[PDB]
Amino acid sequence: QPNDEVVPYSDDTWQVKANDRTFIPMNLFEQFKRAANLYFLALLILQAVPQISTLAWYTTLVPLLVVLGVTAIKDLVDDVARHKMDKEINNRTCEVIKDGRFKVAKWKEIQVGDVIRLKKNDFVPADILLLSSSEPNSLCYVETAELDGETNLKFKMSLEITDQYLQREDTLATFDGFIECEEPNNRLDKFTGTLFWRNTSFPLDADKILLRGCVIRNTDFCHGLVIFAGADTKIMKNSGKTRFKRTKIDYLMNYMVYTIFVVLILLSAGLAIGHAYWEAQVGNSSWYLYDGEDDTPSYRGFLIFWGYIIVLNTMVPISLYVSVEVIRLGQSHFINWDLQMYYAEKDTPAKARTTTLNEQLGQIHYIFSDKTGTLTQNIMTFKKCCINGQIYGDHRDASQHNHNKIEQVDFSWNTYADGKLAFYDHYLIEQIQSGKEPEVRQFFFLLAVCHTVMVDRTDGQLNYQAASPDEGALVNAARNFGFAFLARTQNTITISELGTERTYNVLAILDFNSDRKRMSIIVRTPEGNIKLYCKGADTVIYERLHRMNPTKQETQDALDIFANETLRTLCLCYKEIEEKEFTEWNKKFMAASVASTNRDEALDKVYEEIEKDLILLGATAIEDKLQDGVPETISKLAKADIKIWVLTGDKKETAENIGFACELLTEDTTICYGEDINSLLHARMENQRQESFFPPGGNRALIITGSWLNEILLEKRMRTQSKRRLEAKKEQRQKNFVDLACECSAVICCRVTPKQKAMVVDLVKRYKKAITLAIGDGANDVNMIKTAHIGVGISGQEGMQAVMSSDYSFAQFRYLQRLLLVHGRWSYIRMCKFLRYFFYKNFAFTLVHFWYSFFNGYSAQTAYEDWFITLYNVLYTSLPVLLMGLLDQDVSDKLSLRFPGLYIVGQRDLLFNYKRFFVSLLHGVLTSMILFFIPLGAYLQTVGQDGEAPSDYQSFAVTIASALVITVNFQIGLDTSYWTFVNAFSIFGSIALYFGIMFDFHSAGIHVLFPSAFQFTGTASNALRQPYIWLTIILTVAVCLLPVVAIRFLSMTIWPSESDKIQKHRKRLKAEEQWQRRQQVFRRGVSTRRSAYAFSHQRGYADLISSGRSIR
Amino acid sequence: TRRPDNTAFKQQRLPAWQPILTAGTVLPIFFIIGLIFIPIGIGIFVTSNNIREIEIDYTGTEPSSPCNKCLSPDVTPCFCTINFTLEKSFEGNVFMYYGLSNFYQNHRRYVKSRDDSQLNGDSSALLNPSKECEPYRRNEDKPIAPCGAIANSMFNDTLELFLIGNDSYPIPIALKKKGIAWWTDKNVKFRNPPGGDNLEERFKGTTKPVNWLKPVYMLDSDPDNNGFINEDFIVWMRTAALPTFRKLYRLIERKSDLHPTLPAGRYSLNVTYNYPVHYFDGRKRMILSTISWMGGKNPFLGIAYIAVGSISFLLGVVLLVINHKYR
Ligand SMILES: *[C@@H]1O[C@H](CO)[C@@H](O[C@@H]2O[C@H](CO)[C@@H](O[C@@H]3O[C@H](CO)[C@@H](O)[C@H](O)[C@@H]3O)[C@H](O)[C@H]2NC(C)=O)[C@H](O)[C@H]1NC(C)=O
Ligand SMILES: CC(C)CCC[C@@H](C)[C@H]1CC[C@H]2[C@@H]3CC=C4C[C@@H](OC(=O)CCC(=O)O)CC[C@]4(C)[C@H]3CC[C@]12C
Ligand SMILES: CC(C)CCC[C@@H](C)[C@H]1CC[C@H]2[C@@H]3CC=C4C[C@@H](OC(=O)CCC(=O)O)CC[C@]4(C)[C@H]3CC[C@]12C
Ligand SMILES: CC(C)CCC[C@@H](C)[C@H]1CC[C@H]2[C@@H]3CC=C4C[C@@H](OC(=O)CCC(=O)O)CC[C@]4(C)[C@H]3CC[C@]12C
Ligand SMILES: CC(C)CCC[C@@H](C)[C@H]1CC[C@H]2[C@@H]3CC=C4C[C@@H](OC(=O)CCC(=O)O)CC[C@]4(C)[C@H]3CC[C@]12C
Ligand SMILES: *[C@@H]1O[C@H](CO)[C@@H](O)[C@H](O)[C@H]1NC(C)=O
Ligand SMILES: *[C@@H]1O[C@H](CO)[C@@H](O)[C@H](O)[C@H]1NC(C)=O
Ligand code: BEF
Ligand SMILES: [Mg+2]
């Protein structure tokens, strides 16, 4: 039932008349979406009240205004960049009839029901009803490599009525026809409608409609009428819904912030009960703490709950999000500026068009890639051949092999030859020239006859217009070897054999279709002989070979070798027909060529009747070129424990051939097709009516067609019970399929529609909880680019459909090596370091108030200056962490591509779990403990007790602040492993700036200006000149920093990580063997172990050529 | 679309240093820290041990002391006397402090009860004081010049020292009451109201704090040590950091003669008990200390330095052993 040759669009009235056509919202968004801003505004409101305020109103605004300004500036820059990208990538134009004659107009000025004209190689703007063309019978050839991964050219024809009357712009301008068609939908194969014109109705069909992604080729100009437009086009309805993408670390940060909220609430409540009890016991007896307010101890505790909330608010950071955004912006700009990710030929630098998904590049689990245009260059060439059992094409010189370093044979002797074909083999040239072996020339004569291509000689250059890449390559190879296909007509071909022009007489063309798998042609030679030449798949041709064929085994060996080299193989045969047999078969064929009721079956039977006894000639090998460094990239990403799946819309033969050519599949791998997977799943379901589907030690791969993918996933009141049971069964089947697929080495999906690509990506994401990436080009890959966690579009080509909705846009698949193994890994490491240090240094600063609470009656008295609290998070501990988060590397990029195994560190969430958060919190708690309790012990006794004795509250505050700043700015230095000059400058300049600003505030002039604001006048000058104060500061710093150094050293020495081992031995590393293809896997025992047949062509062209439709 | 600039910053290649924490790079800092902390701790401890300090507690809370009668002073002037001895004579300048224990001067409700504008000598603030010192802002109908709870709760106690000589006649000891406050505090932070030459007319329309026996006028007879610049007032206004604190009271200057400043013998302390602290388990002490040429008597820093040096040396040894065992 399932079909391997059709994409399953099914399993997934409109009326047209012709010629009858900035800062406030960002602030609100950040306030509401980000609960931190609302929290800080609530803190401000609390600080307004005088009965509860414990800190001035400066504290929460001075930083908050800076946060708001920075966020607004970044948002404005991002908006400007987005508007730019949009403006400078949306430059496309087309000719339209909006006035007396044609006018140029952008694609946005198109209205449903307006006639337009297109030229060669011009992307179709919207769905069109082809009205006329320069080609005979108004034919038009379109390439749909981006609507689906098919590299062959389809043909569209228009109505006879519109063909013979709309050949001129004069009639098009006055054209007035009605169209009633189906409403817009996502079905690209069929189209039902009707055109009313000249008081008559004409039905429409898909063979008259050009879609948006089509590219017009082999047609000078084409006039049509727009049917759909904008988002209503059949390819725009296949684009998923854009969603807001958030990294895996954002949710962790949210849970972290909620935990900090809870901890702050608990601490405030505890200190509130503490103060209530203290006031009950000691507060009333104290005759000096009289405020004249009749407040009971419980009321005081309740009132100071809010005071302690205000004091400890700084536990939740105020500059976390701005720091994260700046880090991500800098890393994205690093991605943009990368010079290794620069394609010189197309001049297409990389691009990070979303500046919020950076660390997630270091956590990728799966990659899903298109095939046509992503892993391939859309170029294929004729590499080798086998004639009479001799394999030609391997390196040789003269008539005997001499050396590998041989030159390129010159085709000067030929007249039509050019430089397209790069062939390094001389024995073939001598064999052809000598003529001692006529079958050598017969081989290329067959190559130049059996095709169905067209020839254009407008400039006399003999240009070949081929609807199949394989046919084009073979015809070019034949032409270069002296057999050039010059001209064709209804009943003749005019091949020129070694300079002699012989005009044959074509008698019949036996067409190609997926089931037949072969093509043939019966022609009469000028002498009078009748010969049938056929070429096709080896499997379907080895069942029709004559009894006598000495070269059968040698050609079989050649086919095996070609399949071993990952090449597309075809088998060639010919036979001679007698006059009587030919006339009887011609009678039968003409009988079957008129019965249009069941023409296909009668034609197939007639075709089968003649191709019975065939004499072999050899085989041909066509290599489909891949992008440079594709197999190397795949192997590297496999060493990093990343699984690559290929989701292509191309036929099965091409997908399997590319899978073998990319080294995804090998001789060891056992391939399972749709039916085997379906049987396995059925058996498992019956058993269930866990254990691995396959033995662990085996190697396997999956080749699933779209129809079989739908079949195996079941996608082909009592009603509620039925619905729920069916949904449960579908969920179980989907989980089973996902588990089976993730157990195999490689998975390839072919003949899949965009919805199916999105379905597979979503299934993996959901049932495996894995981070997924999607890379591809064209319009069919947009849905999986919008569904995956990260989406990459291959730019550089004229198709900018997948790049619009992508996240990162480079020009070649190779650069994926540096996106993940350098940029993503570094980004993950840097973000984790930033978060750890940030939470450490924010918790080490606010717990001093908690510790001090025990020595001031739990009265919410700050241990820091009223202005130090303001500038701590902005000036003293802001720059160094950002610099470390922008300019930190553990190993060099050249040493990070050489050891992909490092990636796993981010792949398992090891550098920052939900456990490292509490470790950092404990570190901050201990640091604050020491910072407070060492100065306290120093201050209990004498500290420089004389006339100038700094033993008061302000000296205490400045001592603790200095110790805190030094300790934090030395911890940041301990964290960094890439000591750029700017890193050291910031680390040693934050402390200097703190000291300078402190000495500025503690100045006579500022106090004279207004004394209320500043109370710490003269404390710094008279407190930092005592040796005991400096000894206390040094002791605090040493106690805070020594255990960290000891623990880091012990961890590195006993449990070193991969980066440590690489860095220790970095000096002795010199062995780096470049990846090399596995040269030889030749074996014996089986005549054939795989059929490497592959051909891309569509049925119908022979019908056009046999009739006069395709002849001008 | 064009070729990105080739620069050190843009291409993620900036000249940098790669500090691997090699086993030969962390042991040296441990050993250096130990060897530099041990001698400093020894020196600080030795200096602290060589300081002669005498602390006399005269709160009179516990009976059988010759000051308990002042816990219920029916008569406002209550006088005690404390007899003590100095075994070893002091030398050089001597400092006399009054200390309070269990006296929370770091309370938030207490630290903010202040008006730095009025104490700066501002005519506008001299009347209509700041709202922060509300409980002691106005007495009946006029502003209180030193408003706030800090000014009212000021040490009300006079202390004097006498030496019992061989003649059985107490010998008074001169006590200097100047130069016991920060220079900036006396010359910048605190200043008298502007205008006039007589302090009497300067504070016109302002009463005294409700607790002060006499107004700001009679704090001192000298015109350079009365007003808001009084040093006994500045010293108190400088709030302490912990419940227990010592505030400088008097300076005893070394006599130019070779004899000790405080010759060893017997001494009597003459305290006028006026400041009550027994309600909330507070304590009052008088401390006589001598000058050091490194700070003062701080055994805590010396002991901590000794301990940290020893621990650093032990950690260095242990880390060396671990490095050898897992080399
Ligand atoms: C400061 O010295 C004075 C005496 O030398 C003592 O403090 C306070 O002294 C005043 C009297 O000068 C007491 O006045 C109170 O006044 C109200 C009415 O105005 C009256 O109802 C009270 O019963 C009392 O008479 C004040 O209570 C007293 N402060 C106390 C007892 O805490 C004390 O020696 C030193 N105290 C301070 C805070 O400086
Ligand atoms: C929720 C977890 C993480 C605990 C975090 C908060 C604690 C720091 C709070 C909770 C209960 C609080 C205690 C509740 C009651 C008191 C009685 C309070 O009153 C007194 O005993 C002193 C009065 C006097 O000295 O006469 C002393 C502080 C204390 C122990 C509090 C100290 C701070 C505590 C331990
Ligand atoms: C990290 C490991 C190696 C040591 C963990 C020990 C800590 C749990 C100890 C060390 C210092 C201790 C603190 C030392 C002093 C105090 C003050 C104490 O209160 C008082 O002494 C009275 C306060 C007053 O005078 O009003 C309450 C317990 C507390 C916070 C202690 C809590 C427990 C601490 C943090
Ligand atoms: C290796 C590090 C990471 C572990 C944590 C070390 C703590 C256990 C240390 C750091 C600060 C030390 C405190 C520093 C100061 C003091 C004050 C000290 O009290 C006095 O000096 C006066 C004693 C008195 O006169 O009553 C009592 C020990 C204590 C709490 C220390 C207890 C031990 C502490 C908490
Ligand atoms: C360097 C890292 C790896 C270890 C950090 C731990 C130190 C902070 C601990 C270890 C020993 C502790 C000391 C142990 C003993 C004392 C004596 C103690 O003083 C007393 O109470 C005794 C009476 C007197 O001071 O004379 C004051 C705390 C102190 C200095 C402790 C301060 C904190 C110290 C240095
Ligand atoms: C101190 O000693 C003298 C010696 O006569 C005595 O009169 C006085 O009462 C004593 N004071 C005390 C013990 O407080
Ligand atoms: C000083 O002590 C003596 C003890 O007799 C006595 O004069 C009085 O108690 C004190 N001085 C004054 C002025 O009260
Ligand atoms: F471009 Be893919 F092969 F659909
Ligand atoms: Mg593609």
Author numbering:
A (entry chain A): 16 to 27, 63 to 71, 106 to 773, 787 to 813, 833 to 1228
B (entry chain B): 25 to 351
List passages from the publication reporting this PDB structure:
P4-ATPases flip lipids from the exoplasmic to the cytosolic leaflet, thus maintaining lipid asymmetry in eukaryotic cell membranes. ATP8B1 forms a binary complex with CDC50A and displays a broad specificity to glycerophospholipids, but regulatory mechanisms are unknown. Similar to many ion-transporting P-type ATPases, P4-ATPases consist of a transmembrane domain containing ten membrane-spanning α-helical segments, as well as three cytosolic domains, the actuator (A), nucleotide-binding (N), and phosphorylation (P) domains involved in catalysis. Importantly, most P4-ATPases form obligatory binary complexes with members of the CDC50 protein family, which are essential for correct targeting of the flippase complex to its final destination and for its transport activity.
We determined the structure at 3.1 Å resolution of an autoinhibited state by cryo-electron microscopy (cryo-EM). To stabilize the complex in the autoinhibited E2P conformation (E2Pautoinhibited), the sample was incubated in the presence of beryllium fluoride (forming e.g. BeF3-, BeF2(OH2) adducts, referred to as BeFx) mimicking phosphorylation. Comparison with other P4-ATPase structures and the presence of an extra density in the phosphorylation site confirmed that our structure resembles an E2Pautoinhibited state with bound BeFx. The transmembrane domain of CDC50A is made of two interacting transmembrane α-helices and three N-linked glycosylation sites are clearly visible in the cryo-EM map (N107, N180, and N294), indicating that S. cerevisiae supports glycosylation of this human transporter. Interestingly, the N-terminal region (Q16-D27) was found to interact tightly with the P-, A- and the N-domain of ATP8B1. Similarly, the C-terminal tail of ATP8B1 engages in hydrogen bonds as well as several salt bridges and hydrophobic interactions with the three cytosolic domains. Noteworthily, F1211 in the conserved AYAFS motif interacts via π-π interactions with F596 in the N-domain, which normally interacts with the adenosine ring of ATP in P-type ATPases, thereby preventing ATP binding. We find that ATP8B1 is autoinhibited by its N- and C-terminal tails, which form extensive interactions with the catalytic sites and flexible domain interfaces. Intriguingly, despite addition of PI(3,4,5)P3 during sample preparation for cryo-EM studies, no clear density could be observed for this lipid. The structure of ATP8B1 presented in this report is locked in a E2Pautoinhibited state where the exoplasmic lipid pathway is closed.
